[PDB]
Amino acid sequence: LAASLACAL
């Protein structure tokens, strides 16, 4: 979840 937030942004 954490990495997917960073990736999205």
**DSSP string covering the chain:** -HHHHHHH-
Quote the CA–CA distance of 8 and 5 in Å, as a whole number.
5
DSSP 8: H
Q: What are phi and psi of 6, to 5 degrees?
A: -60, -45
Quote the CA–CA distance of 6 and 4 in Å, as a whole number.
5
Radius of gyration of the chain, Cα coordinates, nearest whole angstrom: 5
